[PDB]
Paper text:
Six NTHs in the hemichannel are placed at the cytoplasmic entrance, whereas those in GJIChs are at the inner surface of the pore. The entrance-covering conformation appears to be stabilized mainly by intramolecular hydrophobic interactions of F5 and L9 in NTH, with T95, L96, V99, I100, and W103 in TM2. With this structure, we analyzed the solvent-accessible pore diameters along the pore axis and found that NTHs form the smallest pore with a diameter of ~8 Å, which is smaller than those of Cx26 (10 Å) and Cx46/50 (11 Å) GJICh structures. We identified long chains of map density on the hydrophobic surface, which likely correspond to lipid or detergent molecules. A strong density blob is located next to R144 in a deep hydrophilic pocket at the boundary of cytoplasmic and transmembrane regions, which spatially fit well at the head group of phosphatidylethanolamine (PE). In our putative PE-bound model, the phospho and amino groups of PE interact with the guanidino group of R144 and the carboxyl group of E13, respectively. In the Ca2+-free state, the tunnel is occupied by six water molecules (W1 to W6) with clear map densities, which form an extensive interaction network with the tunnel-lining residues. Therefore, we propose that the entrance-covering NTH conformation represents a partially closed state of Cx31.3 hemichannel, which would prevent the movement of metabolites through and selectively allows small anions to pass through the hemichannel.
Numbering used by the authors:
A (entry chain B), B (entry chain A), C (entry chain F), D (entry chain E), E (entry chain D), F (entry chain C): 2 to 107, 127 to 221
């Protein structure tokens, strides 16, 4: 109902600044729409785009497995669903609070909702920071055009060629930047609540 | 209606702790979204990724059938729909209880809803535990890179090679962990209701 | 409207037991979700999985047509839409009954709704039983690994090989069991209404 | 709104029998669901299932074009959207009648709705009958297994083979039967309104 | 809301005849459903259905580009979205008129809605007429079975063959007829408002 | 709720002209529908439509990467989601303004909504203008039919041929025109608010 949805939206964002109320939800929606609309077109065919110059049985599959143990499409899907877990717990906690206080009326509980809001921002700051570090460790900042392989069952060292290294590099840097701004604005919303006044005190 | 949906949500979760009210529904939704979004991309092409070094008619199909009698994608779909059966029976039982007590007013029946809640948690604990044991028995904890085959109509013993063993191993361990936490938090919600006070008494 | 939907649900299930109110709708939904999610992955490629050892023009297509005149995917889709026809007629009959008695108020007609409920269960019992018998007659209980063919325009007798006979056998036995329980619980709901007191009297 | 939708459903079916109120809408929905769920799987690959024994340039395409100038999938889609045109005109005429009589109150116009109901049944009887005759003229009652071709630019007479003639024949006879019952029950609903008392008088 | 949607539908069609209120919206919906359901199946594979008898590098692509600079699927999508632009402007103009006159009450503005209705019909008449003329200029009334090509980098003159010319011709004539009736009934709705009394006066 | 949605639409467009209220939203919706319906059919297969006359390993992929570092489909998706970011921030700012002034009543804040409306139009003018300049710099106004390549690991200079250059050129000019009108009508809506009276004063 409108009267109910209108009271729920005012309670979920009563102790937030505009950074947490407007800017963060739009940035996270931007990231998801970009991944769903453009992701499969850039990285979906990476296996048939990895051509090695050989005919020995089993050497091609051994070299591709050593180059990419995990696809970026699978990495990014895990990041967006894990980062959504603290927000879904907080929104469910807020819904049951509004239900079990409507029948009563329709302080001690207002201070419980603030501690839950600080806890999910802190968890999102830790999860977002670990993901950026893993992305740099797994993929770097560029996709090369060739790759040298000396994995068994290959005889000697073989050269393999990759397709579309420019478009894949452009998409990798864009995702780093979009996630980097999500981390900065999560950190800033904790400062405007008083993270500074807690550290040195 | 809001007034009706608001009374239904307060009745379905009146004798639950936060583990059953918030944590379990989010974990089960996480598992389903991960399977639908990433499952086909990891395991969808497993048949054409199984290359055997032979030309005898019918030996390739006999070796693949001996390696995997059932695909993990089919196994995991069965697990999530079977585990949802006790919850759908409980939510339907609760809906008809609220309907046939609204026209009256709008004790003996409050104690019937508690026994139904304990029964579906116990059934989910048994179904979830059997699935984890079968997953380990069928697949183990890793996917190998080669496989030796001596099944008829093959002459001698042939070697077959598999593609992407690292990404398939990573996904198999992730699904074991997500299901393992679902089992732990189902067991804990039965303890907080008084499973301990029933066993030794 | 809630007040209207709430009166409709209480009328459609006023003379039903819990077997007809909870258990049957969940079993029928389980069957449909399993067919839509897993069916195409097991049986969708059966035509290119039927390899015959020959080069004569037209012999391959003649042997596949003699092996499977109808695919199980087409058989099962027909079964689930035919079994839904009696239930859709009953739910429409109930909706117009509630509409043409709201404007009046908002016995003779309560006894018309009971006879319509008994008639659609009896029709579903006949349709479900005929489908199980046809499934056994068309497919049996297992899918073989080879098949011998002496159909024109083949010269002599040729051997053809099939892929994935284990996974196809597992899925065929699962669908027989799910449909078998639907038949048992339709028969039991007619007994709890008084089928026994009508036969010998 | 419920109060509005409830008055609209009682006006659209105030001068109908149960044949027009329950049986016809379910039969037409059955036909559409069967076409969308099973149609592409039976007839979607008919072009690559038409193998001719030749290498002359352009003879294969000339023989397939002489065999099927129109696919059954395209024929059946046209039939279901054309038959829905009289019903959509009638339901729109009824909606504006209820709107322009609510503000007034909320005879001469009740007799206008009856003449519109008789006119759309008569149009559907003519369109449904013409479609059945064209289906028999274009396709017959069976799909053959071979086809002889003497069309230019073929040198001589060549034989072409078709795949899956049994499953295509089964689906063609099923669609004839489903449409045949739609025609019978449209004709019967005009008789129960008084078509008999108009012909001989 | 029903009370709001009910007042909006009576204002958008208060100065229309049944041609503009019922017949035109059904014809335009018919065209869109036919294009989405059957279009890709007839014209989606036109590039691989254009076989030329040559091996020179680049001659095949030069001949197909000279035959079809624009696909009918792209032409028809542009026609239906362009023709919908005047109707979307009119329906938005009507919505804001009803909103900014509800708070007041809930003549000079009734005459503004009539001039806007005449302007969008006139724009649709011009856009629909230009599309029919371009369709005849680009495609004609039939698709041939062969095509002769003397475009560079081809050496000499080569013959190319097309697949399914009968089904493509049938679909092209059907789309001309459906659009031709849309133009006639747009012209007739302007005459019934008084286009005749404006021309000679 | 209707009463709430009706007050929200009147506040979001209380200081707009018809250019911003009707014309701009329809033009932006037109662009998105054209990209989703026709984009993949024109540019989806550009990689297999780039045929080079060579057999050296790795020369084909090096030449395609030098021709197109970024696909137009990826460029246009980024443009439409970036241009939607200022509008989503403004509509969220307006929703919370209406909520936190309903409970009060149900000047200083009316002047805050005007400054936010001017700021998102100015941001959209800068983003739209930069996109048009980049589109001309990356792609020009036409797609050629051939391309000469002297990139390593190619030996000498090779010629590569492209398919369908006419249809790709037609679509590129259409997207430039649709975006050009979006820029003009964003600039005009700032002039009708008083951009002229601010520049020289
Ligand atoms: C109004 C005036 C405005 C002026 C604007 C100036 C701005 C310049 C833009 C630069 C940019 C923007 C990308 C779009 C990002 C959008 C973000 C949204 C993304 C959506 C999610 C594209 O710009 C390129 O466009 C080319 C078009 O062909 C132009 O080519 C010239 O002109 C043509 C004319 O037609 C001629 O035809 C053509 O012959 C000319 O060569 C160049 O100007 C330019 O390189 C990116 O530059 C790119 O350069 C390449 C070069 O190597 C980089 O490759 C790297 O090195 C390779 C070898 O080591 C590796 O192999 C590769 O792996 C690696 O990557 C890329 O990485 C990237 O840095
Ligand atoms: C800010 C500092 C932070 C530091 C972080 C340290 C953490 C280290 C992470 C480790 C991890 C995380 C996977 C992501 C899980 C995400 C969960 C979400 C999943 C979404 C659902 C990927 O890390 C790998 O990344 C490689 C990238 O190429 C790196 O390669 C090096 O550096 C490159 C540099 O570029 C160079 O290019 C490259 O030459 C270097 O070799 C290595 O560092 C590392 O192996 C998993 O390790 C993996 O190792 C492989 C090795 O064998 C395992 O293979 C197993 O053995 C094979 C042979 O028996 C079998 O054949 C295979 O079948 C079997 O499996 C895998 O099983 C797995 O254990
Ligand atoms: C915690 C302890 C718990 C212990 C649990 C014990 C329970 C045992 C389960 C048994 C079951 C469950 C299927 C899942 C059903 C789920 C229902 C949901 C379905 C979703 C809709 C799979 O179990 C199999 O798993 C194998 C895994 O490879 C194991 O192989 C071994 O260990 C591996 C180790 O890794 C080694 O690698 C491997 O070398 C070992 O060989 C075996 O243990 C076993 O055969 C079905 O058994 C199956 O057996 C095969 C054999 O022939 C049947 O084939 C039939 O005969 C062929 C020749 O005539 C025909 O050609 C074929 O056509 C026909 O069919 C199948 O029909 C089916 O009966
Ligand atoms: C509880 C007891 C209950 C007893 C029930 C008795 C009822 C019998 C049913 C009969 C029916 C039902 C189809 C399902 C319709 C469902 C409607 C819903 C459809 C969903 C939209 C399938 O039944 C077939 O099933 C076979 C299974 O293989 C059986 O084969 C035997 O047993 C196997 C055992 O395993 C053995 O393996 C196998 O070796 C045995 O040969 C046969 O019994 C039978 O032919 C249709 O019969 C079909 O026959 C074929 C023969 O030619 C017709 O082909 C026609 O002629 C060809 C040559 O001119 C042309 O080339 C072809 O073009 C043309 O068509 C078909 O047209 C059709 O008439
Ligand atoms: C109850 C009695 C009722 C009697 C009804 C009489 C009505 C006759 C209908 C006629 C119609 C309706 C199409 C359906 C339109 C539906 C609209 C909805 C569309 C959905 C969006 C199909 O009718 C055809 O059906 C054939 C079936 O095979 C019949 O073939 C015979 O009988 C078979 C028996 O089985 C035998 O097997 C078979 O050997 C016999 O040859 C013929 O009767 C007839 O040609 C269209 O006719 C078509 O003719 C072809 C001939 O050339 C035209 O080709 C043109 O010329 C080529 C060479 O220059 C070019 O190459 C081609 O490019 C060009 O096009 C087509 O253009 C079109 O005009
Ligand atoms: C009622 C009277 C009304 C009269 C109307 C007059 C208007 C004329 C329209 C002109 C237009 C409209 C495109 C539709 C735009 C719709 C916008 C919506 C788009 C949806 C998003 C299509 O018109 C073409 O149609 C041809 C049909 O085949 C006609 O061909 C003749 O007649 C046939 C008869 O059948 C005969 O068969 C056929 O043999 C005849 O040759 C010609 O008339 C004409 O070229 C575009 O013209 C196009 O010309 C080509 C030529 O080169 C241009 O190619 C360029 O050069 C190449 C070589 O350098 C490059 O290789 C290429 O890369 C480059 O591009 C294109 O770029 C484009 O400019």
């Amino acid at each position: 109902c409108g009267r109910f949805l209108r009271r729920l939206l005012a309670e979920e964002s009563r102790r937030s600044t505009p950074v947490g109320r407007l800017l963060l939800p739009v940035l996270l929606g931007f990231r998801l729409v970009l991944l769903a609309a453009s992701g499969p077109g850039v990285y979906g065919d990476e296996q048939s785009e990895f051509v090695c110059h050989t005919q020995q049985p089993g050497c091609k599959a051994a070299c591709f497995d050593a180059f990419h143990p995990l696809s970026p499409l699978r990495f990014w899907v895990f990041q967006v669903i894990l980062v959504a877990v603290p927000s879904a717990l907080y929104m469910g906690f807020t819904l049951y609070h509004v239900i079990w206080h409507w029948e009563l009326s329709g302080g001690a509980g207002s201070l419980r909702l603030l501690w839950a809001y600080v806890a999910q921002l802190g968890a999102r700051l830790v999860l977002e920071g670990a993901a950026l570090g893993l992305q740099y460790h797994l993929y770097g900042f560029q996709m090369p055009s060739s790759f040298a392989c000396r994995r068994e069952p290959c005889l000697g060292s073989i050269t393999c060629n990759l397709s579309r290294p420019s478009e894949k590099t452009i998409f990798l840097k864009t995702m780093f930047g979009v996630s980097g701004f999500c981390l900065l604005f999560t950190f800033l919303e904790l400062v405007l609540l008083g993270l500074g006044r807690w550290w040195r005190t």
